[PDB]
Amino acid sequence: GSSGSSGRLLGRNSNSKRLLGYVATLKDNFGFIETANHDKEIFFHYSEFSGDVDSLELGDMVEYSLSKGKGNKVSAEKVNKTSGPSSG
């Protein structure tokens, strides 16, 4: 993160839950995420992703959230890479 000019990355955190997923596909414009059920897919733009979308690969874990009612059309927002539990 470092410090300096501080762009627009931080926002609000209180009415937004956290979720995880797995990079299903990585293109040269947008990517997809496979949920735990492996029945649906999330849509996130490179502009929405804050980190190293170019470094991301297939199988890696990521953090995202949802903010829509019941529907087939779902998309993520403010996506960012995140680590998980493992032998350190």
UniProtKB/Swiss-Prot annotation:
It comes from the Eukaryota. The modification Phosphoserine is found at residue 14. Residues 19-79 form the CSD domain. It is found in: Cytoplasm; Cytoplasm, Stress granule; Cytoplasm, P-body. Component of a multi subunit autoregulatory ribonucleoprotein complex (ARC), at least composed of IGF2BP1, PABPC1 and CSDE1. Interacts with STRAP. Part of a complex associated with the FOS mCRD domain and consisting of PABPC1, PAIP1, HNRPD and SYNCRIP. The interaction with PABPC1 is direct and RNA-independent. Interacts with EIF4ENIF1/4E-T. RNA-binding protein involved in translationally coupled mRNA turnover. Implicated with other RNA-binding proteins in the cytoplasmic deadenylation/translational and decay interplay of the FOS mRNA mediated by the major coding-region determinant of instability (mCRD) domain. Required for efficient formation of stress granules. (Microbial infection) Required for internal initiation of translation of human rhinovirus RNA. Belongs to the UNR family. This is Cold shock domain-containing protein E1. The gene is CSDE1.
